[PDB]
Amino acid sequence: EFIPHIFYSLHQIRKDPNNLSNQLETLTGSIRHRLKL
Amino acid sequence: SYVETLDSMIELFKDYKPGSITLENITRLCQTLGLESFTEELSNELSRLSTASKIIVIDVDYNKKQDRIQDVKLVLASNFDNFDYFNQRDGEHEKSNILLNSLTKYPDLKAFHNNLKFLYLLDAYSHKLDLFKYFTELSHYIRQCFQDNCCDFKVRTNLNDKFGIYILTQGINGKEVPLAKIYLEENKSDSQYRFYEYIYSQETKSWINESAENFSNGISLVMEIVANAYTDLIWFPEDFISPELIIDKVTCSSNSSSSPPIIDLFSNNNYNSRIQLMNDFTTKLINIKKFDISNDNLDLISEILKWVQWSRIVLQNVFKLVSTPVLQLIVSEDHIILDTISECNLYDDVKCWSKFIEKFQDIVS
Amino acid sequence: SYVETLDSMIELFKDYKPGSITLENITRLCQTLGLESFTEELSNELSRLSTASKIIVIDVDYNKKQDRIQDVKLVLASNFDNFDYFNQRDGEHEKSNILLNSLTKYPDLKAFHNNLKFLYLLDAYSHKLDLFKYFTELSHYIRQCFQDNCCDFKVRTNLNDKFGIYILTQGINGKEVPLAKIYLEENKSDSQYRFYEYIYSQETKSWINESAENFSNGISLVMEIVANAYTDLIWFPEDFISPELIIDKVTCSSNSSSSPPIIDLFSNNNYNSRIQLMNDFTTKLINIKKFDISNDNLDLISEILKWVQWSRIVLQNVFKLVSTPVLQLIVSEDHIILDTISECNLYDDVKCWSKFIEKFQDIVS
Numbered sequence: 001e002f003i004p005h006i007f008y009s010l011h012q013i014r015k016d017p018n019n020l021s022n023q024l025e026t027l028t029g030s031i032r033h034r035l036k037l
Numbered sequence: 038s039y040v041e042t043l044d045s046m047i048e049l050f051k052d053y054k055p056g057s058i059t060l061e062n063i064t065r066l067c068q069t070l071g072l073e074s075f076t077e078e079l080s081n082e083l084s085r086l087s088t089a090s091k092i093i094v095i096d097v098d099y100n101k102k103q104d105r106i107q108d109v110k111l112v113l114a115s116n117f118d119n120f121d122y123f124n125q126r127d128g129e130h131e132k133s134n135i136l137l138n139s140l141t142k143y144p145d146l147k148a149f150h151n152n153l154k155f156l157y158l159l160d161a162y163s164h165k166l167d168l169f170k171y172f173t174e175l176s177h178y179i180r181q182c183f184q185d186n187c188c189d190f191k192v193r194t195n196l197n198d199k200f201g202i203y204i205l206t207q208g209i210n211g212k213e214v215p216l217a218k219i220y221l222e223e224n225k226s227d228s229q230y231r232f233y234e235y236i237y238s239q240e241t242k243s244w245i246n247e248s249a250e251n252f253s254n255g256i257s258l259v260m261e262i263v264a265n266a267y268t269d270l271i272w273f274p275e276d277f278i279s280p281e282l283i284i285d286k287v288t289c290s291s292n293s294s295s296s297p298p299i300i301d302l303f304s305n306n307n308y309n310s311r312i313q314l315m316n317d318f319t320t321k322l323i324n325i326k327k328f329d330i331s332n333d334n335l336d337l338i339s340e341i342l343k344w345v346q347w348s349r350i351v352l353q354n355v356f357k358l359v360s361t362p363v364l365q366l367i368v369s370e371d372h373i374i375l376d377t378i379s380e381c382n383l384y385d386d387v388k389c390w391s392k393f394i395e396k397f398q399d400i401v402s
Numbered sequence: 403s404y405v406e407t408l409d410s411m412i413e414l415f416k417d418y419k420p421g422s423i424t425l426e427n428i429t430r431l432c433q434t435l436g437l438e439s440f441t442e443e444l445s446n447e448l449s450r451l452s453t454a455s456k457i458i459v460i461d462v463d464y465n466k467k468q469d470r471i472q473d474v475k476l477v478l479a480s481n482f483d484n485f486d487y488f489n490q491r492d493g494e495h496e497k498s499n500i501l502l503n504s505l506t507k508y509p510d511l512k513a514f515h516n517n518l519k520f521l522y523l524l525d526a527y528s529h530k531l532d533l534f535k536y537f538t539e540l541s542h543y544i545r546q547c548f549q550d551n552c553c554d555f556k557v558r559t560n561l562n563d564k565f566g567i568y569i570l571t572q573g574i575n576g577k578e579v580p581l582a583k584i585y586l587e588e589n590k591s592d593s594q595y596r597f598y599e600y601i602y603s604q605e606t607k608s609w610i611n612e613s614a615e616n617f618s619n620g621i622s623l624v625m626e627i628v629a630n631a632y633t634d635l636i637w638f639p640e641d642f643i644s645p646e647l648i649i650d651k652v653t654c655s656s657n658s659s660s661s662p663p664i665i666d667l668f669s670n671n672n673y674n675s676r677i678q679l680m681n682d683f684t685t686k687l688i689n690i691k692k693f694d695i696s697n698d699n700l701d702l703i704s705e706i707l708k709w710v711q712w713s714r715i716v717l718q719n720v721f722k723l724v725s726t727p728v729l730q731l732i733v734s735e736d737h738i739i740l741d742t743i744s745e746c747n748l749y750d751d752v753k754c755w756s757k758f759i760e761k762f763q764d765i766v767s
Contacts, residue, residue: 013067014050017043116607118550170605236612239539240532242481249614 002034009034055147057129058084058106058140060099066146067095070157079396083107090160092169095136095153099125109137111156113135114165122200138198148198155200158221158256161224162232166251168221171234174201178237178244179219179338185242191214191244203263203388204338207348215263216345219330222254222284228255243337255321259302260328260338262345268357271348272297272322274370278341284335297322299356309401347383350390360399375400377391423471423505425451425464448472457534460501460518469607474502476521480528487565490558503563503709513563520565523586524542527597527693531616533586536599539690540569543602543609544584544703551704554752557582568628569703580628581710584623584703585610586693587649595622598698610699624649625703625737627710628691633722636713637662637687639735647699649692662687664721674724674766682734684711711726712748715755721765740765762763 009031017024056062060076065315067074067088067337072095077085079098088099092115098108109121123132139148159168173194179202180192191205191213203217224230237243262271270287290376296304303316330338359366367374372382373393378400381393425441427678432439433452437460443448444463451462457480463473474485488497502515524533538559544567545557556570556578569586589595596617600609627636635652654660661669666679695703716738724731732739737747738758743765746758 003333011054011062014054015056015069017050025351036042051482115605117605119604165606167605170603186726205615238528240480240535245613 057146112301218261225259258331274320287324420510531618583626589622622694625695639685652689
C-alpha cells in the first residue's frame with residue numbers, strides 16, 4: 001500500500017513545515033520512495 | 038517579508054488541506070496551536086484527549102469501537118464559567134455544542150480549527166480584561182443598544198457551528214438573514230493597540246468605558262459583512278467611514294475591469310427605455326468586507342448596518358430593475374428620487390424603502 | 403430633639419390613620435410629600451389626578467359615577483423607561499399594577515403611601531446615579547450572584563403590592579417563603595454617606611464599582627429579614643456582622659425578661675429527659691431585623707441568608723423539639739453535635755441539615 005502513506009506524509013508536511021530541514025528531507029525521500037514503488 | 042510570506046503559505050496550507058477527523062490529526066492540530074495535549078483511557082471502548090492552555094481546557098471523548106467522537110467539553114479556568122459554546126437555535130431544547138458539531142457534522146477539521154483558533158485567541162489575550170466574559174456580555178449590550186435606538190435587528194450568538202455575534206434582519210419571507218458577524222481578531226498592524234472594555238449604559242444610552250485600566254493589547258473587535266454571495270456585494274461611499282477603520286478592502290486587482298456594477302450602469306446604455314438615470318454620487322464606491330469597531334467605534338455598528346440594509350433593499354433592487362431590458366431617476370449617496378413621483382432616503386424607515394421599491398417596480402414593469 | 407420627636411409623631415399619625423381612599427385624600431397625601439398635583443376632567447364620567455416630581459409622573463384615573471379608581475399610570479422623565487411597577491406573579495398574563503392595587507385592594511391609603519414614599523425616595527436621590535435604573539438592574543445582579551455562588555434562593559421583584567427585591571426559599575411544601583426584602587431607605591445617621599453603583603461581574607464573580615464617580619448621598623441599601631411572625635424571630639451572634647451595619651436592633655426594652663428563647667432554654671430544666679443540652683456559644687445572641695448592605699457589603703447578602711436559612715431549618719427546629727416535654731446535644735454558633743450519632747454545620751448543604759433534623763426528631767419522639 002502506498003495511497004494512505006502518501007496521504008499521511010502529505011499531511012504532516014502541510015501541518016508542520018517548522019520542522020528542521022532534516023525531517024523535511026527525510027520525509028520527502030520517503031514520498032519519493034513510495035511513488036518510486 | 039520571508040516570515041510574513043511563510044506564515045501566509047502556512048495559513049494557506051492549513052486552509053487548503055485541513056486533514057481528516059482522526060484522534061491523531063486533532064492532537065497534531067492542537068499541538069500546532071501550542072496547546073498542551075494528553076490522552077487518557079477512560080475504558081476499553083473510550084479514550085479522552087484532553088487539551089489545555091492558560092484558561093481553556095477541552096476534553097474530547099473518542100469511541101474506539103465506532104471510530105467516532107462521542108462528546109466534547111469546554112472548561113474555563115476563569116472565574117467566568119458562563120461562556121456560551123452552544124449554537125443558538127430558537128425552539129430546539131438540545132443546545133447543540135459547536136465543538137462537537139465541528140467534529141461530527143463536517144468532513145474535515147476546518148470547522149474545528151477555526152473555532153479552536155477563536156478560543157485560543159480569547160485565551161492568549163485574556164488577563165484585567167477577561168475576553169470570555171466581555172465577549173459574552175457584548176452580545177447583550179449590542180441587543181440593548183438596538184432596542185434603545187429602535188433598530189429592527191436581532192442579535193444571536195454562535196450561528197452555523199461557528200463562534201461569533203451574528204446580526205440578523207427579517208428577509209422578505211420572514212426568514213432571518215445574517216447581515217454582519219462581530220468577533221475578535223488579532224491586530225496584525227499594531228501589537229500596541231489597546232482594546233478596552235466598553236459597556237452599553239441603559240442610563241446614558243451610550244457606550245461607556247467604565248474601566249480604562251482594563252485593556253488587552255494586539256486585538257481588534259471586527260465587524261464582518263456577511264454577503265449572501267457581484268450584484269450581492271455591498272458598496273460604501275469612500276468617505277462613509279474613516280479609512281483607518283477599514284481592515285479588508287476588496288481591491289479589484291488591476292487585471293479584471295469590474296467597476297462597481299453601479300458605475301458600469303452609469304456607463305452602459307443598456308437601460309430600461311422608460312428611465313433616464315442620473316448619478317449624483319460625490320464619492321467613489323468601495324467594497325468593504327471588514328470594519329474595526331473597537332473602543333469608541335461601537336456607535337458605528339448601527340450606522341453601518343442601516344447602510345447595509347438600505348443598500349440591499351433600495352440600491353441593489355433599483356439596480357436590478359434598471360438593468361433588465363422618460364422618467365428621471367436621480368441616485369445619490371443617501372437619497373433616491375424618481376422625478377416628482379417618489380423619493381426615499383437612508384434615514385427613512387424600512388417601510389418607506391419597501392413602498393418606494395414597490396412603486397418603482399410597478400412603473401418599470 | 404423637638405424636630406426629631408415631631409417627625410416621629412407625624413410618622414406615627416400618618417401610619418395610625420392613613421385616611422380613606424378618596425380623590426381629595428390622595429391629592430392631600432401627594433401634596434404632603436411635596437408632589438405637584440393637578441386635576442383634569444377627561445370626560446363627564448372621568449377625572450384624572452396627575453402628580454409630578456423631578457423624575458416621576460403619576461396619573462390616577464377616577465370614575466365619578468362609580469366613586470372608584472379606574473387606572474393608575476407611572477411615567478418616568480429618566481432615559482430609563484423600564485422601571486418595573488408590576489407585581490411578579492408566576493403564571494398570570496395580567497401584570498397587576500402595584501399603585502392601582504394599593505388603591506383598589508386595600509381599605510386605606512397605607513399601602514399607597516408606602517409605595518409613593520419609596521418612589522419619592524428614588525426620585526429625590528436620583529441624579530450621575532440613576533436609582534430607578536440601578537434598583538431594577540440590582541435584582542438581576544443578585545439573581546446572578548446566587549447562580550454563580552450555587553445558592554438555592556429565588557429573586558423576585560414587587561411582592562404583595564409592595565416595592566422591593568424579595569429573596570425567597572423553598573419551604574417544606576415546595577411553597578416559596580420570603581426570607582428577606584432588599585430596598586433603599588434614607589440614611590438618617592449620615593447625610594454625607596456615599597452610595598455607589600455596584601455591578602455583579604460575571605467575569606470576576608465579584609461585585610465591582612465600575613464608576614466611583616456615580617454616587618448618591620444620604621441613601622442606604624437595606625436588607626430586611628422577613629420574619630413569618632418569639633420562636634419565629636431570627637437571632638444572630640453579636641460578632642457575626644460589624645455593629646456599624648446594624649440598622650435595627652430589637653432592644654428587648656428592660657421591663658420584659660425575654661432572653662432569646664434559646665438562652666431561656668439553657669436556664670430552664672424543662673427539657674426532653676433524653677437530652678443533656680450543652681451551650682458552646684462564645685457570643686451573645688442578638689435579634690437583628692435590618693442590615694446596611696450598601697457598597698462593599700453586597701457580598702454579605704449570601705452569608706446573612708445562609709445563616710437565616712440554617713437558623714430556621716436547624717436551630718429553631720432543634721429548639722422546638724428540645725422544648726416539648728441521656729444523649730449529649732452540643733449547640734455552638736456554626737455547628738450542632740448530637741453525641742457520636744449526628745452532626746451538622748452552617749457550611750453543609752440544606753440536604754445535610756434536613757437529614758440531621760429528621761434523625762434528631764426520630765430520637766426525641
